[PDB]
Design a protein around this ligand. Structure first.
Ligand SMILES: CCCCCCCCCCOCCOCCOCCOCCOCCO
Ligand SMILES: CCCCCCCCCCOCCOCCOCCOCCOCCO
Ligand SMILES: CCCCCCCCCCOCCOCCOCCOCCOCCO
Ligand SMILES: CCCCCCCCCCOCCOCCOCCOCCOCCO
Ligand SMILES: CCCCCCCCCCOCCOCCOCCOCCOCCO
Ligand SMILES: CCCCCCCCCCOCCOCCOCCOCCOCCO
Ligand SMILES: CCCCCCCCCCOCCOCCOCCOCCOCCO
Ligand SMILES: CCCCCCCCCCOCCOCCOCCOCCOCCO
Ligand SMILES: CCCCCCCCCCOCCOCCOCCOCCOCCO
Ligand SMILES: CCCCCCCCCCOCCOCCOCCOCCOCCO
Ligand SMILES: CCCCCCCCCCOCCOCCOCCOCCOCCO
Ligand SMILES: CCCCCCCCCCOCCOCCOCCOCCOCCO
Ligand SMILES: CCCCCCCCCCOCCOCCOCCOCCOCCO
Ligand SMILES: CCCCCCCCCCOCCOCCOCCOCCOCCO
Ligand SMILES: CCCCCCCCCCOCCOCCOCCOCCOCCO
Ligand SMILES: CCCCCCCCCCOCCOCCOCCOCCOCCO
Ligand SMILES: CCCCCCCCCCOCCOCCOCCOCCOCCO
Ligand SMILES: CCCCCCCCCCOCCOCCOCCOCCOCCO
Ligand SMILES: CCCCCCCCCCOCCOCCOCCOCCOCCO
Ligand SMILES: [Cl-]
Ligand SMILES: [Cl-]
Lengths: 453, 452
C-alpha cells in the first residue's frame, strides 16, 4: 500500500533530505535555464518588446507566488498527515487543494483581466509596449488555473516523497518551453507574444501529465476521489496558514529588491544597478540548490512533525543546514575564483558598456551571503513544514526588509564604502538574520520536545 | 509453431493489445500530420494558384487512399481472425491474395482514372493555372497508385499480425523522408507545387522498398509469403472483400456527404462558408487521429478474439477502446474549445480574416463536441470490421453521414434561421444519434454472438 516516495519520506532523515533535494535542484536548474534563455530571445526583439515583458513581469511573479504558495501549503499539510499515518487526512487535503487551485486560478483570471490596462499605464508607459503587454498578459492570465494546478500537483507529489515526478513535471514544462521559445518567437514569427504561447502550451502539456498521474493512473500514494473529501475549515486553514505567508514572503523579497535598487542608485548611479542586477543573477548558481533543499526540508520536517518525532525533526533540520552550507561553500569559493571569467561573459558580450571593474569586485564580496542563506532558508522551510507559515514570513521580513535593506542603506549613506557598501550591507545584514533564524529554529524545535514530554 | 510478439499480443490480454496496437498508429499518423503541415507551408508560399491546385486534387488523392486503405483493412482484419483461430495456412493465404490484389487494383486505378482525369477536372472547373497544376499533380500520384495500394496492403499485413510497430516505422520513414525531399523538389529543383507530388511519390516508393524487403527478402514476418503451391480461393477473396469493399464505400459515403455539407454552408455562410468548413474539417482530421488509432487496434483485437471464438474477450477489447478514446477526446475537445481563437488564427492569415476567422471560433466552441460522441460509433464500426461484417459498418457510416448529418444540417438550414451556427449543431446532433444507435447496434450484435 506504500509507495517508494513515502518509504523514502519516513525513512532515515538524512537520506530523505538528500534524495528529495536532488531532483528538485535539477528541476529548478532547467527552470533557471529557461528563464535565462527566454531573456536572451526577448532581448533580440527590440525595446518595446522588452518593455512589454517588463510591464507584465511583476504581475506574472504575483501569479507564481500565489501558485507556489498554495503548493507549499499543500505539500506541507500532506507531509504532516502522511507522517501521522493519517492517509484519509492526506487524501482529503489533496482534494481540497485541487479544488482551491481551480478557485484561485479562476479568481486570478477574472480579477486581473479588466485591471491590466489601468495597471500598465500607471507606469506612465504608453503605445506599443502597453498594447503588447496587454496581449501578452491575456495569454498567461487565461491559463492561470493551469499554473496553479501544476504547482499544486507538484506540491502533492513532493509532499508524499515523489520528488522524482515533481522534477519530471518541471523538466517537461521548462524543457518544452526552451524548445518552443525560439520556434514561436522567430520561426513562426509571432514575436514577443510567441513566448507567451510557448509557456502556455508547455504548461498545458505539463498539466495533462499531472492530471494523468493524479486522476488516471492514480498511482500516487494519496487517493484522489470526490468521496473522501469532507469539506473542512480546518484543512483550509492549515493550507492557508502556510500558503498565504509563503506568497507574502515573495512580495517582501520583491519590495526589498526594489529598495536595494534605489540604494544602488544613490551609491553608483544607473550602472550601479547594472552591477547589482548582474551580481545577484550570478549568485543564483548558489541559490538554486538551496531552494531545492528547502522543499525537501519542508516535507521531511513535516513528516517528522506528524510522526510526533521532534528528534528526527531536529536531525533533518540541522542536517539540511549542514549540507546546504557545504554546497554553498563550494559554489562561493568557485564564483570568487573565477569572478573575472563569469563577469567577463556578460560585460564583454556587450562591448559598448563596461562595468566589469565593479562587477568583479562585487563577485568577491556579495557571494559570501550564500553561506549564511541556509540558516534563514532551512529554518523558514522547517516553519512551513510544521505548518507555522507566519513565523517563516516574519523571519523573511526581518532578513530582507529590515537587515539587508537597513545595513545597505546605512553603509551607503553614513560611510565612505560607496557602491561596495551595498554588497557589504547585504552580507552583514544576512549574517545577523542567519543568527536570528538559527537560534529561533532551534528554539522552536526544543520547545516541541518540552511539549511532546 | 514459432510465434512473434505481435501474435502473442493478439492472443493475450485484450486491454494490453488494444493499447500496444493503437499507440504506434497514432505516432505514425502524427508524423504524417507534421509532414502535411510543413508541406502546406511550402505550398502556400508558391501563391494562390498552387494553393488552389492542392484543393482541387485532394479529393482524387482521397479516392486512391479510400481504395488502398479499404483493401488494407480487409487484409488486416482477415489475417487477425485467422491468427486468432490458429489458422496459419489461411493467414499466409490472405497475405498472398492481398498482395496480388494490390497489383490488380493499383494498375486498374491508373488505367481507368488517368485518361479520365483531364475531362473530369475541366468539366466542373473550367481552367486556370490551378486547374492545369491540379491535373498534373493528379497524374503523378495516379501513376503511382500501385505503390500506394501496395503500401497499405503491406501495412495491413503488419498490423494484422500484431506488428503495429513496424507499420508505424514504415509510416514514419516515408513521411520523414517526404519532409526532407519536399523543399528540395519544390524550391531547390524549382518544380513548384508539382514538386511535392514527386517528393511524395518517391517517398512512397522508398516505403515500398522497405515493405517489399520485409515481406519478400528478409521474410521475418509471422505469416509465410510465397507463390509455392499457391491455390487461389473464393473463400479468401470473399473474406477480404466483405470488409475491404464496404470500407472503400464508407469513405465514398463520407465524401458524398462532405460535398453536401460544404454546400449547406453556402446557404448558411455564403461562399466563405466553403473555406469556413474546409478549415473546420482540417482541424477535426487532426482531432480524430487518436480515434483512428483506437479503431485499427479494435479491428485487429476483436478480429483475433472472433477467431478465438471468445465473445467476452471481443467485448472487453471493444468497450475498452471506447473507454480510452472517450477519455482522450475529452482532453482534445477541452483544449480545442478552451483555447479556440488561437487555433482559428493559424488557418486564417488572409484578406477579410475576421469573417472566416470569427465564425470558426464559434464553430470551435460548438462543433468539437462531436469527437466526444464519435468513439461509441467508430469503435462499433471497427468491431463490425473485426468480425468480418463490413456491410454493417458501411450501413452505420451511411446512416451517420448521408442520413443523420445531412438530414439534420438540411432541416436546420431550411426550417431554422440560425444559418451557419445551426450547421455545426445539425452535424453534432446527427453525430449524437448515430453514436448511440451505432453503440446500440454493436451491443445487440455481440449479444447475438453468444447464442446457439
Ligand atoms: C536534463 C535533466 C535530465 C532529466 C532526466 C533524468 C532522469 C531521472 C530518472 C529518475 O526518475 C525516476 C522516476 O521515478 C518515478 C517516481 O519515483 C517515486 C519515488 O521513488 C523514490 C526512490 O527514488 C529513486 C531515485 O532514482
Ligand atoms: C560549481 C557548481 C556547484 C553547483 C552545486 C551543485 C549541488 C548539487 C548537490 C549534490 O548533492 C550531493 C550531496 O551528496 C551527499 C553526500 O552523501 C551524504 C553523506 O551524508 C552522511 C549521512 O549519510 C546518510 C545517508 O546520506
Ligand atoms: C546549480 C545546479 C545544481 C543542480 C545540479 C546537481 C547535479 C545533478 C546531476 C546533473 O544534472 C545535470 C542537469 O543539470 C542542469 C543544469 O546544467 C547546467 C549546465 O548547463 C550547460 C548548458 O546546458
Ligand atoms: C499557437 C498560437 C498562435 C497564436 C499567435 C499569436 C499572434 C496573434 C494571435 C491572435 O489570436 C487571437 C486570440 O486572441 C485571444 C487572446 O486570448 C489570450 C488567451 O487565449 C488563450 C485561451 O483563452
Ligand atoms: C525529465 C525528462 C522527461 C520529461 C517528461 C517526463 C514525462 C513523464 C515521465 C515518464 O515517467 C517515467 C516513469 O518511470 C518510472 C520508472 O523509471 C525507472 C527509471 O529508473
Ligand atoms: C539551455 C540551452 C538553450 C539553447 C537555445 C534554445 C534551443 C531551442 C531549440 C531549437 O529551436 C530552434 C528554433 O530555431 C530558431 C532560429 O532562430 C534563429 C534566428 O534568431 C535571430 C534572433 O536572435 C535573437 C537573439 O540573439
Ligand atoms: C481542479 C480539479 C479538481 C479535482 C477534484 C477531484 C478530482 C477527482 C476526479 C478523479 O476521480 C477519480 C475517479 O475514480 C475513477 C474510478 O473510480 C472508481 C470507482 O468505481
Ligand atoms: C497577497 C499575496 C500576493 C503576493 C504577491 C507577490 C508579489 C511578487 C512579485 C515579485 O516581483 C519581483 C520583484 O522584482 C521586481 C523588479 O525586478 C525586475 C527584475 O527583472
Ligand atoms: C571558469 C572557466 C575558466 C577557464 C577560462 C579561463 C580563460 C581566461 C582566464 C584568465 O586567467 C584566469 C586566471 O585568473
Ligand atoms: C506483372 C504484371 C505487371 C507488370 C508491371 C506493370 C508496369 C506498369 C504498372 C503501372 O502502369 C502504369 C504506367 O503508367 C506510368 C506512366 O504514365 C503516367 C505518366 O504521367 C506523367 C504525368 O506528368
Ligand atoms: O493517408 C494519409 C493522408 O494524408 C494526406 C496527405 O498524404 C500524403 C502522404 O505522404 C506521406 C509520405 O508517404 C510515405 C508512405 O509511407
Ligand atoms: C529515411 C528514408 C531513407 C531511405 C534510404 C533508402 C532505403 C532503401 C530500401 C532499404 O531496404 C533495405 C534492403 O536491404 C537490401 C536488400 O537487398 C535486396 C537483394 O536481396 C537479395 C535477394 O533478393 C532477391 C529479390 O530482390
Ligand atoms: C520524379 C522526377 C520527375 C521530374 C523529372 C524532370 C521533369 C521536368 C518537369 C518540368 O520542370 C519544371 C520546371 O523546372 C525545371 C526543372 O526541370
Ligand atoms: C532516395 C531513393 C533511394 C533509392 C535506393 C535504391 C536502392 C535499391 C536497392 C534494392 O532495394 C532493397 C530491397 O528492396 C526489396 C527488393 O525486393 C523487392 C523489389 O521491389 C519489389 C516491390 O515492388 C515495389 C518496387 O517499387
Ligand atoms: C505484388 C504481388 C506479389 C505477389 C506475392 C508473391 C511474392 C512471394 C515470393 C517472394 O519470396 C518467396 C520465397 O519463396 C521462394
Ligand atoms: C503476380 C502473381 C501471379 C501468380 C499467379 C499464380 C502463380 C502460382 C500458381 C501456381 O503454383 C505454382 C507452384 O509453385 C511452384 C513454386 O514456385 C512458384 C513460382 O511460380 C512463379 C509464377 O510466376 C508467374 C509470374 O507471371
Ligand atoms: C483507463 C481505465 C479504463 C478502464 C476503466 C474501467 C471503468 C469503467 C466501468 C466498468 O466498465 C465495464 C465494462 O468494461 C469493459 C472492459 O473495459
Ligand atoms: C484528464 C487527463 C487526460 C490525460 C490524457 C488522457 C488519456 C487517458 C487514456 C487512458 O488510457 C489508459 C490506458 O491504459 C494504459 C495501461 O494501463 C494499465 C492499467 O492497469
Ligand atoms: C447499403 C449497402 C448494404 C449492404 C448489404 C446490406 C445487407 C445487410 C443488412 C443488415 O444486416 C443485419 C444482419 O443482422 C445480423 C446478421 O448476422 C450476421 C450476418 O452475417 C452472416 C454471415 O454468416 C451467416 C451465419 O449466420
Ligand atoms: Cl527559424
Ligand atoms: Cl507516465
Amino acid at each position: 500500500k506504500t509507495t517508494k516516495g513515502v518509504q523514502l519520506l519516513r525513512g532515515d532523515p538524512k537520506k530523505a533530505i538528500v534524495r528529495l533535494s536532488i531532483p528538485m535542484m535539477i528541476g529548478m536548474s532547467v527552470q533557471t535555464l529557461y528563464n535565462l534563455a527566454d531573456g536572451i530571445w526577448v532581448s533580440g526583439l527590440g525595446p518595446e518588446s522588452l518593455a512589454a515583458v517588463g510591464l507584465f513581469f511583476p504581475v506574472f511573479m504575483g501569479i507564481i507566488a500565489l501558485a507556489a504558495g498554495l503548493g507549499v501549503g499543500t505539500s506541507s499539510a500532506i507531509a504532516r498527515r502522511i507522517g501521522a499515518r493519517d492517509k484519509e487526512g492526506a487524501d482529503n487535503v489533496a482534494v481540497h487543494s485541487l479544488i482551491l487551485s481551480l478557485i484561485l486560478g479562476v479568481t486570478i483570471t477574472i480579477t486581473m483581466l479588466p485591471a491590466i490596462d489601468s495597471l500598465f499605464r500607471s507606469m506612465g508607459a504608453k503605445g506599443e509596449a502597453v498594447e503588447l503587454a496587454i496581449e501578452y498578459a491575456r495569454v498567461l492570465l487565461a491559463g492561470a488555473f493551469i499554473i496553479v494546478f501544476n504547482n499544486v500537483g507538484n506540491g502533492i507529489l513532493r509532499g508524499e516523497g515523489d520528488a522524482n515526478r515533481a522534477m519530471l513535471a518541471m523538466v517537461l514544462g521548462s524543457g518544452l518551453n526552451i524548445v518552443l521559445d525560439p520556434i514561436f518567437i522567430y520561426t513562426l514569427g509571432f514575436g514577443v507574444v510567441g513566448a507567451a504561447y510557448a509557456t502556455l502550451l508547455s504548461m498545458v502539456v505539463t498539466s495533462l501529465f499531472i492530471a494523468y498521474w493524479l486522476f488516471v493512473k492514480r498511482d500516487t500514494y494519496v487517493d484522489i476521489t470526490l468521496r473522501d473529501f469532507s469539506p473542512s475549515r480546518e484543512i483550509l486553514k492549515d493550507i492557508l496558514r502556510v500558503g498565504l505567508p509563503s506568497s507574502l514572503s515573495q512580495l517582501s523579497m520583491s519590495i526589498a529588491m526594489f529598495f536595494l535598487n534605489s540604494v544602488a542608485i544613490t551609491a553608483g548611479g544607473e550602472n550601479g544597478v547594472a552591477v547589482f542586477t548582474s551580481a545577484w543573477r550570478i549568485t543564483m548558481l548558489g541559490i538554486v540548490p538551496i531552494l531545492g533543499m528547502a522543499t525537501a526540508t519542508t516535507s521531511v520536517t513535516g513528516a517528522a512533525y506528524g510522526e510526533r518525532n521532534v528528534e528526527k525533526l531536529e536531525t533533518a533540520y540541522l542536517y539540511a543546514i549542514k549540507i546546504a552550507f557545504m554546497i554553498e561553500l563550494a559554489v562561493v569559493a568557485f564564483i570568487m575564483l573565477f569572478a573575472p571569467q563569469v563577469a567577463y561573459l556578460f560585460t564583454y558580450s556587450e562591448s559598448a558598456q563596461v562595468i566589469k571593474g565593479d562587477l568583479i569586485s562585487a563577485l568577491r564580496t556579495l557571494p559570501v551571503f550564500l553561506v549564511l542563506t541556509p540558516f534563514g532558508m532551512m529554518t523558514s522551510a522547517m516553519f512551513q513544514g510544521i505548518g507555522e507559515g507566519e513565523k517563516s514570513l516574519i523571519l523573511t521580513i526581518f532578513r530582507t526588509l529590515v537587515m539587508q535593506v537597513g545595513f545597505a542603506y546605512i553603509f551607503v549613506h553614513y560611510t565612505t564604502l560607496g557602491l561596495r557598501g551595498v554588497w557589504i550591507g547585504i552580507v552583514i545584514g544576512n549574517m545577523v538574520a542567519a543568527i536570528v533564524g538559527f537560534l529561533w529554529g532551534r528554539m522552536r524545535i526544543s520547545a516541541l520536545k518540552k511539549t511532546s514530554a
